[PDB]
Design an enzyme around this catalytic site. Structure first.
Site, PDB file in Angstrom:
ATOM      1  N   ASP B  25       0.791  -1.211   0.000  1.00 56.76           N
ATOM      2  CA  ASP B  25       0.000   0.000   0.000  1.00 56.76           C
ATOM      3  C   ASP B  25       0.838   1.283   0.000  1.00 56.76           C
ATOM      4  OD1 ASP B  25      -2.899   1.120   1.971  1.00 56.76           O
ATOM      5  OD2 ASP B  25      -1.929   1.901   0.166  1.00 56.76           O
ATOM      6  N   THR B  26       0.971   1.867  -1.183  1.00 57.85           N
ATOM      7  CA  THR B  26       1.726   3.109  -1.355  1.00 57.85           C
ATOM      8  C   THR B  26       1.046   4.316  -0.710  1.00 57.85           C
ATOM      9  OG1 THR B  26       0.673   3.572  -3.489  1.00 57.85           O
ATOM     10  CG2 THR B  26       2.712   2.292  -3.471  1.00 57.85           C
ATOM     11  N   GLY B  27      -0.245   4.184  -0.406  1.00 62.97           N
ATOM     12  CA  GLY B  27      -0.982   5.237   0.279  1.00 62.97           C
ATOM     13  C   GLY B  27      -0.854   5.264   1.793  1.00 62.97           C
TER      14      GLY B  27
HETATM   15  C1  LIG Z   1     -11.929  -1.834  -0.127  1.00 60.02           C
HETATM   16  C2  LIG Z   1     -11.768  -0.617   0.751  1.00 60.02           C
HETATM   17  C3  LIG Z   1     -10.825   0.418   0.174  1.00 60.02           C
HETATM   18  O1  LIG Z   1     -10.200   0.230  -0.870  1.00 60.02           O
HETATM   19  C4  LIG Z   1     -10.716   1.705   0.970  1.00 60.02           C
HETATM   20  C5  LIG Z   1      -9.583   2.629   0.538  1.00 60.02           C
HETATM   21  C6  LIG Z   1      -8.660   2.898   1.700  1.00 60.02           C
HETATM   22  O2  LIG Z   1      -9.077   3.565   2.633  1.00 60.02           O
HETATM   23  N1  LIG Z   1      -7.442   2.360   1.602  1.00 60.02           N
HETATM   24  C7  LIG Z   1      -6.411   2.451   2.620  1.00 60.02           C
HETATM   25  C8  LIG Z   1      -5.947   1.029   2.936  1.00 60.02           C
HETATM   26  C9  LIG Z   1      -7.150   0.207   3.356  1.00 60.02           C
HETATM   27  C10 LIG Z   1      -7.635  -0.804   2.522  1.00 60.02           C
HETATM   28  C11 LIG Z   1      -8.747  -1.552   2.906  1.00 60.02           C
HETATM   29  C12 LIG Z   1      -9.378  -1.300   4.113  1.00 60.02           C
HETATM   30  C13 LIG Z   1      -8.902  -0.290   4.946  1.00 60.02           C
HETATM   31  C14 LIG Z   1      -7.790   0.462   4.567  1.00 60.02           C
HETATM   32  C15 LIG Z   1      -5.298   3.381   2.144  1.00 60.02           C
HETATM   33  O3  LIG Z   1      -4.535   2.779   1.085  1.00 60.02           O
HETATM   34  C16 LIG Z   1      -4.353   3.809   3.271  1.00 60.02           C
HETATM   35  N2  LIG Z   1      -5.088   4.692   4.205  1.00 60.02           N
HETATM   36  C17 LIG Z   1      -4.591   6.089   4.182  1.00 60.02           C
HETATM   37  C18 LIG Z   1      -5.152   6.840   2.977  1.00 60.02           C
HETATM   38  C19 LIG Z   1      -6.683   6.887   2.966  1.00 60.02           C
HETATM   39  C20 LIG Z   1      -4.530   8.237   2.894  1.00 60.02           C
HETATM   40  C21 LIG Z   1      -4.827   9.115   4.087  1.00 60.02           C
HETATM   41  S1  LIG Z   1      -5.136   4.100   5.717  1.00 60.02           S
HETATM   42  O4  LIG Z   1      -6.242   4.757   6.359  1.00 60.02           O
HETATM   43  O5  LIG Z   1      -5.386   2.687   5.681  1.00 60.02           O
HETATM   44  C22 LIG Z   1      -3.763   4.408   6.509  1.00 60.02           C
HETATM   45  C23 LIG Z   1      -3.617   5.588   7.237  1.00 60.02           C
HETATM   46  C24 LIG Z   1      -2.438   5.884   7.914  1.00 60.02           C
HETATM   47  C25 LIG Z   1      -1.362   4.987   7.871  1.00 60.02           C
HETATM   48  O6  LIG Z   1      -0.162   5.221   8.504  1.00 60.02           O
HETATM   49  C26 LIG Z   1       0.091   6.321   9.389  1.00 60.02           C
HETATM   50  C27 LIG Z   1      -1.502   3.810   7.143  1.00 60.02           C
HETATM   51  C28 LIG Z   1      -2.692   3.520   6.466  1.00 60.02           C
END
Ligand SMILES: CCC(=O)CCC(=O)N[C@@H](Cc1ccccc1)[C@H](O)CN(C[C@@H](C)CC)S(=O)(=O)c1ccc(OC)cc1
EC number: 3.4.23.16
Lengths: 99, 99
Positions: B25-27
């Site tokens: 996960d690059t995000g």
């Molecule tokens: C099928 C559902 C999705 O595709 C939802 C998209 C999503 O929120 N993606 C997240 C990763 C994820 C995937 C599935 C379920 C829950 C989470 C995203 O790639 C990473 N998110 C941060 C994004 C939204 C940018 C702010 S995260 O909330 O999971 C996250 C936040 C902080 C962090 O580190 C400090 C690591 C991950």
């Protein structure tokens, strides 16, 4: 380009003649942008993330140029913490993970 | 290897005697794993995404093997719906985005 991950993969996108920064997000199925106006019909949709579910507006067949690469697809608009480009458009621009 | 994004970029990771499937996960700035009772010291933290925040436990210097590549670093443990391999470890296994 090749993009390393020591920094957030933020890129400039062009959508409706507006430039925005968005995060290339391989963990996202869908592309989700912060509150903005887009033309045309939309549909109410709900999506889930790490913190639960939110309500978004679904716009279909929206052109976005991502780092100079053209996409036309679905853009969700709502209370995402940051603009994210998800797999639906990452696939269109030929984006892969490599190691 | 090259991983296309037609489907979720799930890969097998290993953390002690637990093999799990996790998103490259690059995000994600940080690595977030589903609830597991890891040994050692930790610190509480709150991380935010779509839907809001969840509470996690931050463990440092945890070895993780990702597709046979060795990594070691911070892992956040809490009630995430999916195991997430974030940039802190993606860089260690040599992972880039390319298009
Ligand atoms: C099928 C559902 C999705 O595709 C939802 C998209 C999503 O929120 N993606 C997240 C990763 C994820 C995937 C599935 C379920 C829950 C989470 C995203 O790639 C990473 N998110 C941060 C994004 C939204 C940018 C702010 S995260 O909330 O999971 C996250 C936040 C902080 C962090 O580190 C400090 C690591 C991950």
């Amino acid at each position: 380009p090749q993009i390393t991950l020591w920094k957030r993969p933020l890129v400039t996108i062009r959508i409706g003649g507006q430039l925005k920064e968005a995060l290339l997000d391989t963990g996202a199925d869908d592309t989700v942008l912060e509150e903005m106006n887009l033309p045309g019909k939309w549909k109410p949709k709900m999506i889930g993330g790490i913190g639960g579910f939110i309500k978004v507006r679904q716009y279909d067949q929206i052109p976005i140029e991502i780092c100079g690469h053209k996409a036309i697809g679905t853009v969700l608009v709502g209370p995402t913490p940051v603009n994210i480009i998800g797999r639906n458009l990452l696939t269109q621009i030929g984006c892969t993970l490599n190691f």
